[PDB]
Design a protein around this ligand. Structure first.
Ligand code: SF4
Ligand SMILES: [Mg+2]
Ligand SMILES: [Mg+2]
Ligand SMILES: [Mg+2]
Ligand SMILES: [Mg+2]
Ligand SMILES: [Mg+2]
Ligand SMILES: [Mg+2]
Ligand SMILES: [Mg+2]
Ligand SMILES: [Mg+2]
Ligand SMILES: [Mg+2]
Ligand SMILES: [Mg+2]
Ligand SMILES: [Mg+2]
Ligand SMILES: [Mg+2]
Ligand SMILES: [Mg+2]
Ligand SMILES: [Mg+2]
Ligand SMILES: [Mg+2]
Ligand SMILES: [Mg+2]
Ligand SMILES: [Mg+2]
Ligand SMILES: [Mg+2]
Ligand SMILES: [Mg+2]
Ligand SMILES: [Mg+2]
Ligand SMILES: [Mg+2]
Ligand SMILES: [Mg+2]
Ligand SMILES: [Mg+2]
Ligand SMILES: [Mg+2]
Ligand SMILES: [Mg+2]
Ligand SMILES: [Mg+2]
Ligand SMILES: [Mg+2]
Ligand SMILES: [Mg+2]
Ligand SMILES: [Mg+2]
Ligand SMILES: [Mg+2]
Ligand SMILES: [Mg+2]
Ligand SMILES: [Mg+2]
Ligand SMILES: [Mg+2]
Ligand SMILES: [Mg+2]
Ligand SMILES: [Mg+2]
Ligand SMILES: [Mg+2]
Ligand SMILES: [Mg+2]
Ligand SMILES: [Mg+2]
Ligand SMILES: [Mg+2]
Ligand SMILES: [Mg+2]
Ligand SMILES: [Mg+2]
Ligand SMILES: [Mg+2]
Ligand SMILES: [Mg+2]
Ligand SMILES: [Mg+2]
Ligand SMILES: [Mg+2]
Ligand SMILES: [Mg+2]
Ligand SMILES: [Mg+2]
Ligand SMILES: [Mg+2]
Ligand SMILES: [Mg+2]
Ligand SMILES: [Mg+2]
Ligand SMILES: [Mg+2]
Ligand SMILES: [Mg+2]
Ligand SMILES: [Mg+2]
Ligand SMILES: [Mg+2]
Ligand SMILES: [Mg+2]
Ligand SMILES: [Mg+2]
Ligand SMILES: [Mg+2]
Ligand SMILES: [Mg+2]
Ligand SMILES: [Mg+2]
Ligand SMILES: [Mg+2]
Ligand SMILES: [Mg+2]
Ligand SMILES: [Mg+2]
Ligand SMILES: [Mg+2]
Ligand SMILES: [Mg+2]
Ligand SMILES: [Mg+2]
Lengths: 137, 231, 208, 149
RNA sequence: AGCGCCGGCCAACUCCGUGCCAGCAGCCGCGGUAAUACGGAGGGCGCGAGCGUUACCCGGAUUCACUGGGCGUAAAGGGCGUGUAGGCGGCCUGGGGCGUCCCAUGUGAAAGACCACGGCUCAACCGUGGGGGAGCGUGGGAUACGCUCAGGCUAGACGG
RNA sequence: CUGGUCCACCCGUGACGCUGAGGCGCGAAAGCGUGGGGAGCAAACCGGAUUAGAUACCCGGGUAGUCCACGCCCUAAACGAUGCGCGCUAGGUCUCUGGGUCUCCUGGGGGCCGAAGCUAACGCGUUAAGCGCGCCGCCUGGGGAGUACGGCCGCAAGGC
C-alpha cells in the first residue's frame, strides 16, 4: 500500500456507490482528522473506532437522500464526488491566496496546515495555507 | 388483521437461486431454501395494508396482475369480489404505456358483444361469422378483466414481480405505485410496497389476496363474508 | 468616411424602420410603408431560414446603421465598453448615446443624425461655450450643448427648435428652446431608448 | 405552451433489393425561456412528421433548470459516450458563449449568461444528450443544505 | 470612391456565353450542350481611403493533454525473469524545522500593461498619481503533511 | 540430484517493502559449426497425372533436416493481441487441490453466467477492460519502412 488517504477515500466512494450502510478502514490519526472534517460538513453521518481481528479500525456511517420515483428509485448521493489532490508522486501545496473554491461554494477542500486539518473556508478565515488533501462535493 | 396465521400457510420459498438484495427479509437457510422473517412480513404488511386502505377510501382503482399457473383462479375471484380490474392470462406488452391503443381493442370487444345478439343480424356469411367468433373468443380471453379499466390505474397489485417484470417496468415508468408479493428471488427496489411472502404456494396467495380484498371491501362500507377457499 | 448612398434600402433590408431621413420617415411615403421587402431582384421571394450567424450579423448591422458609425469605430467602442466595469450591453448603449452628433439629434437641433453630423462638423454647435466640430466627441454628464451665438438666427435651426417646442426630450436630457441650449444630465438608461435591438445578440456576435 | 427550436435534421438510409430507402430524423428542443426545457428525437418517413414527433417527445421529457440571475448555480462537467460538455456560470453581461446545439438548449431554458466548451466527440445528438444530463445534475445551495444538514 | 465576395463552411441570385475546352480551387470539389462553383451582365452582401493576396507566429489543435489524452480489437504493454541507479512507501511517541505555510523588511529601475484624474476642439498621443507583480536576500513564527534523527508496534515482508 | 508453490500451527525477526532506465540470465520452430546417428517422415530435387499452362494442390520416389553432444543464432499471431504490486466493489454455477466443527464453513488455482460500474461498440465484470495509488515500457494520420545511413552484435543467414 502506498497512499492510505487515497485508499480511505476510495473505500468511501466504493461503499457509497452501492448504498452500503457503513464501511471499515484501517485506523490512523490523520484519517481520523479527515473523517471529523467530513462529519462536521454533513457528508457522513459519523464515524467510530472498533476492533477487527484485534486491529484498530474506523467505521464510517454513510448518508443518502430519499427514495426516488421512476425507472430508477435509488436515492441520490450526498457525496457526489470525492477526489485526492496531493499524491505521493506529486505533492500539491497552495498559499492562502491560491486556495481553490470548490463548486462555487457548494463543495469543500481539505487542507493540512500548520494549524491542523481545516476546510478551505476555515483556512481562509485563519489566513493560512498548506497541503491540499482532497476535494468533496 | 393477519395475527400470526402466516406460519400455518407459508414461511417462504426458493433455495440458493436467490437475489441478494432480498437479504433484509431472510432469517435462515435450513433445508437449503430461505425462510422469510415473519416479523418483517408483518411490519411491511401493516404499511402495505394502510396504503391500500387509504387508496380504496379515495375511490382509486387497483389493477390486480397475476398470470402464473398457481394464480389464474385466485386472482380472478379476488379481483371480481371488489369489482376491480385484473390481468390473469397474459400481460400484453404496452397494456399501460400504450393504454389508448390497447384499450381500442375493448371497443371492438364490446361492439362484438352487441353484434352476436339475436335481434339485429344473423345474415353474415358463415366464414365471416367464424372469423368474427375467433376474434371475439380471443378478445374475451385476453381482455375480460382489462375491460373494467376506464383510465390508467392508481396502483397495480402483482403476485410475482420477477415473473412479471414487464408490468412492473410499465408501472414504474408511468409513476404508478406497485404492490407485490415476492419470494427470495425478487428485486425489492422496484417494488414500492413489498410483502415478503411466498408467492408460489396456493394458500399463501389465497390468504394475502383474500384479506387484502376484505380490507378494500371494508373501505367502501360493507362486509361480504364468504370467499372461495379451495384446498 | 461614412455611408453616403441610398438610405431606405437599409430599412428595407433590416425589415424595420430606421428613422434615418427625418420628416419623410413619419410621412405616408416612407419606403417601409410601401415596399417592406428587401431591395433587388429577389426581394419578393420567400425567405429562407436564417442561420445563427445571419441573425447576429443582421442585429449588429441594424444597431450600427441606426447611428451611422463605421465598423472600426463601432468595434473600438464595443471593446472599450467590454473593458469597463458594468453590464457591457448597457455600457455600450450609453457610450453610443454619448456621441455629440447623436446628442444634438436628440436635443432637437436636427431632424436626423446625418443632419446632426453636418451641423456639428460645420461649426454650428458649442459645448460649454467653446466650439466643437467633431461628431465623435463624447459628452460627459453636466456638459452644456448649445447652438453657436452667431448661429441662432439660422432658418434651419429656427424651424427645428420651432417644431420641438411641443416635443419633450428624454429624462436623461434637458432642453431650453427659448435659451436654445441643452444639458446632458446622465447616461441614458437601457429602458429609455426605444431601440429595436437585442444587445445580447451583438455581444454574442463579437464573441465569435 | 412553449417555444420550439429545430436543432437537427438528417436523412438516413437503409438498403433492400431495389436500392436505398430513406428516413428522416429530427432533433427538436422545446422550452419556455423561464426554467423548463426538453429534448426530443423523432424519426419518420417524412420531414414534417419527424418534426412533429420530435416535439411530441420533447414535451414529455423536461428538466427544471435551477436558474439564478440568468446563469447556473455552479460549474458542471458531463460525459455522454465520448462527448464532453463543460458549463460555467458568468456575469450578467457575458451572454451565451456556446456552440449551436448547447446554445439552443440553454437559450430555450432561460439561460442568458454562460460559458461552455465541447470536448471530445462533437456529434450533435450526443452533445445535446450531454447538455440535458448536465442541466439535470444542477443543484442549488438550498438543495445541498437540505441534503447535508 | 474603391476593393473583395455571392455552391457549403459563410452574408449575398438570376440571365446569357461556353461544353472535361476555356478556366476556378483553402478543403469538399466545379466544368463532358439547360453551370446559383468558369467568363460577362443585372442585382446583392461585407468593408471603405482602403480592399484583397503571399510569407511568418499564436489560436481554433484537449492534435505532446501540468491545467487537459491514451495503449484487448482503432496508433500504442517490452518474449520472460533477476536486478543496478533512480522514483515511491505501514501504525504510535518525542526532538530538529530542510521542504511547506504565515508575518515584517530590502529588492523587483524607467518606459510598457491596469485604475483614476488631467492637456492637446475629440481620438491617437502625452502628463501626474496610485496599485499591483513571479522570483530572490534578511529577521521572526507554526509543525498538520513530506524529510530527517531517536524509541517503540506487528496488519506488509521474510523465517521456523 | 534440484527449483518453485500451497495449507495448518500463529512460534521467531521487526517495515527488512514495491517498481525498475542500463547490466546479466533464459528464450518454440527454422537456421549455422564440429563429431555421431539415420527407422519413419520430408524443404530442395526427379518422375506421373491434372490443366490453356501447373515451376502447385493429388500420386511414386528423394537429399538436407527432423534425433544426440557441445558451441552459436535470439526471432514469432514469443497472444489473454490485456506490464507488475497492493487495497476496495452483489452473487450463481462447474472443476482441481488443502484444512476443519467433513450437512456446511474456511484457504489456494482453473472455467462459465451475471450486481454496480465501465466501453465507440463488441464485450469486461473479485482471474476487471470497475474504483484508486506507486513505478516501468510504449503511441501521436496512411504509404515510403522496420527501409536507408551511422553504430553495435553474428561464422553466415541476419538481429538491435
Ligand atoms: S422613410 Fe422609412 S424607409 Fe426611408 S429612411 Fe425613413 S424610416 Fe427608413
Ligand atoms: Mg513525489
Ligand atoms: Mg421502459
Ligand atoms: Mg459520442
Ligand atoms: Mg472517454
Ligand atoms: Mg476528435
Ligand atoms: Mg447563406
Ligand atoms: Mg469552379
Ligand atoms: Mg473568381
Ligand atoms: Mg449555360
Ligand atoms: Mg466561389
Ligand atoms: Mg457568373
Ligand atoms: Mg481568441
Ligand atoms: Mg477543431
Ligand atoms: Mg495546445
Ligand atoms: Mg481546445
Ligand atoms: Mg495528463
Ligand atoms: Mg486520443
Ligand atoms: Mg487496444
Ligand atoms: Mg479498448
Ligand atoms: Mg489490425
Ligand atoms: Mg494513433
Ligand atoms: Mg494494434
Ligand atoms: Mg507480455
Ligand atoms: Mg507486441
Ligand atoms: Mg518468452
Ligand atoms: Mg540489474
Ligand atoms: Mg526486483
Ligand atoms: Mg532488465
Ligand atoms: Mg533500491
Ligand atoms: Mg523551513
Ligand atoms: Mg516598474
Ligand atoms: Mg479631456
Ligand atoms: Mg506612472
Ligand atoms: Mg529569512
Ligand atoms: Mg512519513
Ligand atoms: Mg523505526
Ligand atoms: Mg518455479
Ligand atoms: Mg509470533
Ligand atoms: Mg520487540
Ligand atoms: Mg510497498
Ligand atoms: Mg530507472
Ligand atoms: Mg532458441
Ligand atoms: Mg512452438
Ligand atoms: Mg531445432
Ligand atoms: Mg546440424
Ligand atoms: Mg509434379
Ligand atoms: Mg489439357
Ligand atoms: Mg511427395
Ligand atoms: Mg516417402
Ligand atoms: Mg534423407
Ligand atoms: Mg505465448
Ligand atoms: Mg500486444
Ligand atoms: Mg494494455
Ligand atoms: Mg514493466
Ligand atoms: Mg475461483
Ligand atoms: Mg468462480
Ligand atoms: Mg465468463
Ligand atoms: Mg461477464
Ligand atoms: Mg468471471
Ligand atoms: Mg481501454
Ligand atoms: Mg497528430
Ligand atoms: Mg534493421
Ligand atoms: Mg548497416
Ligand atoms: Mg561477424
Ligand atoms: Mg527484422
Amino acid at each position: 500500500l502506498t497512499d492510505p488517504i487515497a485508499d480511505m477515500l476510495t473505500r468511501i466512494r466504493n461503499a457509497t456507490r452501492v448504498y452500503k450502510e457503513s464501511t471499515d478502514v484501517p485506523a490512523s490519526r490523520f484519517k481520523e482528522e479527515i473523517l471529523r472534517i467530513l462529519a462536521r460538513e454533513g457528508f457522513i453521518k459519523g464515524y467510530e473506532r472498533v476492533d477487527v481481528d484485534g486491529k484498530p479500525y474506523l467505521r464510517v456511517y454513510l448518508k443518502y437522500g430519499p427514495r426516488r420515483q421512476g425507472p430508477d428509485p435509488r436515492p441520490e448521493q450526498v457525496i457526489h464526488h470525492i477526489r485526492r489532490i496531493s499524491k505521493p508522486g506529486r505533492r500539491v501545496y497552495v498559499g492562502v491566496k491560491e486556495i481553490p473554491r470548490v463548486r462555487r461554494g457548494l463543495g469543500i477542500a481539505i487542507l493540512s496546515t500548520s494549524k491542523g486539518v481545516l476546510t478551505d473556508r476555515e483556512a481562509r478565515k485563519l489566513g493560512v495555507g498548506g497541503e491540499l488533501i482532497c476535494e468533496v462535493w | 388483521v393477519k395475527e400470526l396465521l402466516e406460519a400455518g400457510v407459508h414461511f417462504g420459498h426458493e433455495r440458493k437461486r436467490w437475489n441478494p438484495k432480498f437479504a433484509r427479509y431472510i432469517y435462515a437457510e435450513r433445508n437449503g431454501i430461505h425462510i422469510i422473517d415473519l416479523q418483517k412480513t408483518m411490519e411491511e404488511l401493516e404499511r402495505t395494508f394502510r396504503f391500500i386502505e387509504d387508496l380504496a377510501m379515495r375511490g382509486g382503482t387497483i389493477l390486480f396482475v397475476g398470470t402464473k399457473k398457481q394464480a389464474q383462479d385466485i386472482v380472478r375471484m379476488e379481483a371480481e369480489r371488489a369489482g376491480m380490474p385484473y390481468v390473469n392470462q397474459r400481460w400484453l406488452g404496452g397494456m399501460l404505456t400504450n393504454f389508448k391503443t390497447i384499450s381500442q381493442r375493448v371497443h371492438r370487444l364490446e361492439e362484438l358483444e352487441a353484434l352476436f345478439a339475436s335481434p339485429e343480424i344473423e345474415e353474415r356469411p358463415k366464414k365471416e361469422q367464424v372469423r368474427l367468433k375467433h376474434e371475439l373468443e380471443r378478445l374475451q380471453k385476453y381482455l375480460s378483466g382489462f375491460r373494467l379499466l376506464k383510465r390508467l390505474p392508481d396502483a397495480i397489485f402483482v403476485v410475482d414481480p420477477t415473473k412479471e417484470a414487464i408490468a412492473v417496468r410499465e408501472a414504474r415508468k408511468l409513476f404508478i405505485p406497485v404492490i407485490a408479493l415476492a419470494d427470495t428471488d425478487s428485486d425489492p427496489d422496484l417494488v414500492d410496497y413489498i410483502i415478503p411472502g411466498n408467492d408460489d404456494a396456493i394458500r399463501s396467495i389465497q390468504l394475502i389476496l383474500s384479506r387484502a380484498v376484505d380490507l378494500i371491501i371494508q373501505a367502501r362500507g360493507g362486509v361480504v363474508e364468504p370467499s372461495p377457499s379451495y384446498a | 468616411g461614412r455611408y453616403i448612398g441610398p438610405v431606405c434600402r437599409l430599412c428595407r433590408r433590416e425589415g424595420v424602420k430606421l428613422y434615418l431621413k427625418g420628416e419623410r420617415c413619419y410621412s405616408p411615403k416612407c419606403a417601409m410603408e410601401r415596399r417592406p421587402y428587401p431591395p433587388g431582384q429577389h426581394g419578393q421571394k420567400r425567405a429562407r431560414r436564417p442561420s445563427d450567424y445571419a441573425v447576429r450579423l443582421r442585429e449588429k448591422q441594424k444597431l450600427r446603421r441606426i447611428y451611422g458609425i463605421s465598423e472600426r469605430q463601432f468595434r473600438n467602442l464595443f471593446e472599450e465598453a467590454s473593458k469597463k466595469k458594468g453590464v457591457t450591453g448597457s455600457v455600450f448603449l450609453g457610450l453610443l448615446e454619448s456621441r455629440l452628433d447623436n446628442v444634438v439629434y436628440r436635443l432637437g437641433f436636427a431632424v436626423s443624425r446625418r443632419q446632426a453630423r453636418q451641423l456639428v462638423r460645420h461649426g454650428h454647435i458649442t459645448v460649454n461655450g467653446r466650439r466643437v466640430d467633431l461628431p465623435s466627441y463624447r459628452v460627459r454628464p453636466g456638459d452644456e450643448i448649445a447652438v453657436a451665438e452667431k448661429s441662432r438666427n439660422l432658418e434651419l435651426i429656427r424651424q427645428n427648435l420651432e417644431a420641438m417646442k411641443g416635443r419633450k426630450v428624454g429624462p436623461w436630457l434637458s432642453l431650453d428652446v427659448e435659451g436654445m441650449k441643452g444639458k446632458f444630465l446622465r447616461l441614458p438608461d437601457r429602458e429609455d431608448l426605444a431601440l429595436p435591438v437585442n444587445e445580447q445578440l451583438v455581444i454574442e456576435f463579437y464573441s465569435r | 405552451d412553449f417555444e420550439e427550436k429545430m436543432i437537427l435534421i438528417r436523412r438516413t438510409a437503409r438498403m433492400q433489393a431495389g436500392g436505398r430507402r430513406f428516413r428522416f430524423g429530427a432533433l427538436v428542443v422545446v422550452g419556455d425561456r423561464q426554467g423548463r426545457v426538453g429534448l426530443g428525437f423523432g424519426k419518420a418517413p417524412e420531414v414534417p412528421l419527424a418534426v412533429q414527433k420530435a416535439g411530441y417527445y420533447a414535451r414529455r421529457n423536461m428538466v427544471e433548470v435551477p436558474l439564478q440571475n440568468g446563469t447556473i448555480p455552479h460549474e458542471i462537467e458531463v460525459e455522454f459516450g465520448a462527448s464532453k460538455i463543460v458549463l460555467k456560470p458568468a456575469a450578467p453581461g457575458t451572454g451565451v458563449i456556446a456552440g449551436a446545439v448547447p446554445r439552443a438548449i440553454l437559450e430555450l431554458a432561460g439561460v442568458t449568461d454562460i460559458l461552455t466548451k465541447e470536448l471530445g466527440s462533437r456529434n450533435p445528438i450526443n452533445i445535446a444528450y450531454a447538455t440535458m444530463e448536465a442541466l439535470r445534475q444542477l443543484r442549488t445551495k438550498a438543495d445541498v443544505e437540505r441534503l447535508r444538514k
